[PDB]
Amino acid sequence: MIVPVRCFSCGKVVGDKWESYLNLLQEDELDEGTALSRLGLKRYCCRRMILTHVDLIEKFLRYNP
Amino acid sequence: MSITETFEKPQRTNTLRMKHGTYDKLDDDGLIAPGVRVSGEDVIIGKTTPISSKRDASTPLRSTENGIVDQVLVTTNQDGLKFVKVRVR
Amino acid sequence: EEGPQVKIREASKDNVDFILSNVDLAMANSLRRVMIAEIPTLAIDSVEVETNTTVLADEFIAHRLGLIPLQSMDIEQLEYSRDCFCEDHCDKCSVVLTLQAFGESESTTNVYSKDLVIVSNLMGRNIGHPIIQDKEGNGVLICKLRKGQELKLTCVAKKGIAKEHAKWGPAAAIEFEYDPWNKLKHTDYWYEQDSAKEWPQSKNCEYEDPPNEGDPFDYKAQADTFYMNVESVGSIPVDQVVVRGIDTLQKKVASILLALTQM
Amino acid sequence: ATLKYICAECSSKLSLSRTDAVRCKDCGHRILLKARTKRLVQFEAR
Amino acid sequence: MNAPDRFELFLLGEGESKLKIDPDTKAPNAVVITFEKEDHTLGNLIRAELLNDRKVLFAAYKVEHPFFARFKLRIQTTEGYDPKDALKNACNSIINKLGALKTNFETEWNLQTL
Ligand SMILES: [Zn+2]
Ligand SMILES: [Zn+2]
Ligand SMILES: [Zn+2]
């Protein structure tokens, strides 16, 4: 649904970096890998956490009821 | 003929036909409302039936299940019958 | 000061890369476990949902709330709710917060952890403040609302430990290594053609003396000198995690001498 | 005050008993939703 | 539903004590202490220390089943040497060892610039 608050494996707070990841892509035109690394996410467990998320709430928000 | 069913709170009358559940969660319209927590064998849809005064015809929650009422819908069939759909989260 | 030996390499508000020396692996490992699961902390452990028209379910939001890092500086000056002599909760053992958000604008309304409001008396102790570390002061993104959607909650923070639930855990990850050079031979390397060539050399190999060809296996050398690196989640200062960890373990060991006493 | 039932589409709060048919005002839809109770629900943030 | 509460992992239930000491029959000067509401953190710790003591003939610990939070500590010592004393010596030696580490850390933490 939305950015999980912590990384499942280590608990490192990650649910406060979704918007930043997005801007680092559109506005700064950086690549995914180079982006996650600039967000302090070094261990593949945390990296996958954001890189693999699917923000379905956007489509959910698109309903009226 | 004149033998309908009614969604409401049954509390025994000349028949005493009910179930080992607990109708303490149904509103007067004979339906729990969203937000209410249901478990055990609670009654989700209390209904009665006069056979030719009160004979229980209520739908209790599944046994090994327990959650919270996520939604209740009251519609009409193609013929005209009253329909009820209770989604439990 | 004789005994364990700290030798910090790096230090910051998030990590403590150091080098424990002159200690038993057991102690090193015990501390590693305590930091991960037994350091007291405050975290949402009850949520009253008044209004929720959001796209998310209550338990879904509730779940996330409890995962929101909360200031636990003076966590020791907050009694465990299970001990507190009151009925349920009170300012002596719990911090109450509220979340009210409405979809006003047309653009999606974001509900962050900053929007949380403490409604209980903190009595001057640094505790209950939602931790924030993003360059925007928003913190953790709890939910999102469409124009018209509402969300009115009431959270009750409580002191807890990771053992009961990971949310109460102050630590994030804990690097742990020793004997970067497999001199002790605690591990048997897997290989195809060359053990050394195929296995990446560790950072700590630099901080140590490479074994010498001729020297026969040193069968007496034990496991001391561990290269750690703690990482705080924010609810508690990095150095604190360690210190308090060392202290907590110290308490347990003591709770036993006291048991022998009253035994 | 109060809001027994809610409409599926127009979301306009309704409230009627028997013989009152099963429609809503203005919108001829025949759906209606139960509307969340007032009794506040508590949750384990676990 | 069948799963036990989480607090049971560290909270003593009614009718429970932190320590259960019993005399080992398989050997002399031996004891089997049952630590309730504790795991590998303490078991392997006090265990490793009891081993540094030379007047200790035997020391091992084991958690019979991961479902429950408790472990058994068996100790054997030379005649005259009470096993309950080796546990005391070990505990104290730990508390001291840890205390020193807490000090050495809060010190090195000061000499840091960040
Ligand atoms: Zn991770
Ligand atoms: Zn209290
Ligand atoms: Zn309508």
From Swiss-Prot, chain A:
According to its UniProt entry, one GO biological process term is: termination of RNA polymerase III transcription
Q: Which residues form the signal peptide?
A: none
- Cross-link type Glycyl lysine isopeptide (Lys-Gly) (interchain with G-Cter in ubiquitin), residue numbers: 59
Keywords, A to Z, come to: DNA-directed RNA polymerase, Isopeptide bond, Metal-binding, Nucleus, Ribosome biogenesis, Transcription, Ubl conjugation, Zinc
Q: Which GO terms describe its molecular function?
A: DNA binding; DNA-directed RNA polymerase activity; zinc ion binding
Instruction: Provide the protein's localization.
Output: Nucleus, Nucleolus
Which residues form each disulfide bond in the chain? none
Q: Would you tell me the protein name for this molecule?
A: DNA-directed RNA polymerases I, II, and III subunit RPABC5
From Swiss-Prot, chain B:
Phosphoserine modified-residue sites: 52
Where does the source fall among the domains of life? Eukaryota
Localization: Nucleus
Family per UniProt? Answer: Belongs to the RNA polymerase beta chain family.
Role noted for this protein = DNA-dependent RNA polymerase catalyzes the transcription of DNA into RNA using the four ribonucleoside triphosphates as substrates. Second largest component of RNA polymerases II which synthesizes mRNA precursors and many functional non-coding RNAs. Proposed to contribute to the polymerase catalytic activity and forms the polymerase active center together with the largest subunit. Pol II is the central component of the basal RNA polymerase II transcription machinery.
**Subunit details for this protein?**
Component of the RNA polymerase II (Pol II) complex consisting of 12 subunits.
Any other comment in the entry? The binding of ribonucleoside triphosphate to the RNA polymerase II transcribing complex probably involves a two-step mechanism. The initial binding seems to occur at the entry (E) site and involves a magnesium ion coordinated by three conserved aspartate residues of the two largest RNA Pol II subunits.
Protein name, as recorded: DNA-directed RNA polymerase II subunit RPB2
Q: Which residues of the full protein are shown?
A: 868 to 969 of 1224
Curated annotation (Swiss-Prot), chain D:
- In this chain, Zn(2+) is annotated as bound at 7, 10, 24, 27
Name a single GO cellular component.
Answer: RNA polymerase II, core complex
Where do the zinc-finger regions (C4-type) map?
Answer: 7-27
Relay the record's extra comment: Present with 907 molecules/cell in log phase SD medium.
TM ranges are: none
Report the portion of the entire protein shown: 25 to 70 of 70
Coiled-coil residue spans: none
Q: Quick one: where is this thing mainly located?
A: nucleus
UniProt name for this protein: DNA-directed RNA polymerases I, II, and III subunit RPABC4
Subunit details? Component of the RNA polymerase I (Pol I), RNA polymerase II (Pol II) and RNA polymerase III (Pol III) complexes. Component of the RNA polymerase I (Pol I) complex consisting of 14 subunits: RPA135, RPA190, RPC40, RPA14, RPB5, RPO26, RPA43, RPB8, RPA12, RPB10, RPC19, RPC10, RPA49 and RPA34. The complex is composed of a horseshoe-shaped core containing ten subunits (RPA135, RPA190, RPB5, RPO26, RPB8, RPB10, RPC10, RPA12, RPC19 and RPC40) where RPA135 and RPA190 form the DNA-binding cleft.
Q: How is it modified after translation?
A: The N-terminus is blocked.
According to the lineage, what is the superkingdom?
A: Eukaryota
Q: Which GO terms describe its biological process?
A: nucleolar large rRNA transcription by RNA polymerase I; ribosome biogenesis; RNA-templated transcription; termination of RNA polymerase I transcription; termination of RNA polymerase III transcription; transcription by RNA polymerase I; transcription by RNA polymerase II; transcription by RNA polymerase III
Q: Which family does it belong to?
A: Belongs to the archaeal Rpo12/eukaryotic RPC10 RNA polymerase subunit family.
Keyword list, A-Z: DNA-directed RNA polymerase, Metal-binding, Nucleus, Peroxisome, Ribosome biogenesis, Transcription, Zinc, Zinc-finger
Q: Does the keyword Disulfide bond apply?
A: no
**Is this entry keyworded Cell membrane?**
no
From Swiss-Prot, chain E:
GO molecular-function term, one example from the UniProt record: DNA-directed RNA polymerase activity
- Provide the Gene Ontology terms for cellular component: nucleus; RNA polymerase II, core complex
Q: Which residues cross the membrane?
A: none
- Pfam families, per this entry? RNA_pol_L_2
UniProt keywords (A-Z) are:
DNA-directed RNA polymerase, Nucleus, Transcription
Q: Where in the cell is it found?
A: Nucleus
Gene3D superfamilies attached to this UniProt entry = RNA polymerase, RBP11-like subunit (3.30.1360.10)
Under the heading SUPFAM superfamilies, the entry gives:
RBP11-like subunits of RNA polymerase (SSF55257)
Impact when changing residue 108 to G/V? Transcript termination readthrough
A biological-process GO annotation: transcription initiation at RNA polymerase II promoter
Q: Does the keyword Nucleotide-binding apply?
A: no
> What CDD domains would the database entry show?
RNAP_II_RPB11
Q: Which superkingdom is the protein from? A: Eukaryota
Name the InterPro entries for this protein: RBP11 (IPR037685), RBP11-like (IPR036603), RBP11-like_dimer (IPR009025), RNA_pol_Rpb11_13-16kDa_CS (IPR008193), Rpo11-like (IPR022905)
Task: Provide the assembly information.
Answer: Component of the RNA polymerase II (Pol II) complex consisting of 12 subunits.
What does this protein's UniProt record list under function?
DNA-dependent RNA polymerase catalyzes the transcription of DNA into RNA using the four ribonucleoside triphosphates as substrates. Component of RNA polymerase II which synthesizes mRNA precursors and many functional non-coding RNAs. Pol II is the central component of the basal RNA polymerase II transcription machinery. It is composed of mobile elements that move relative to each other. RPB11 is part of the core element with the central large cleft. Seems to be involved transcript termination.
Q: What else is known?
A: Present with 4280 molecules/cell in log phase SD medium.
Similarity section: Belongs to the archaeal Rpo11/eukaryotic RPB11/RPC19 RNA polymerase subunit family.
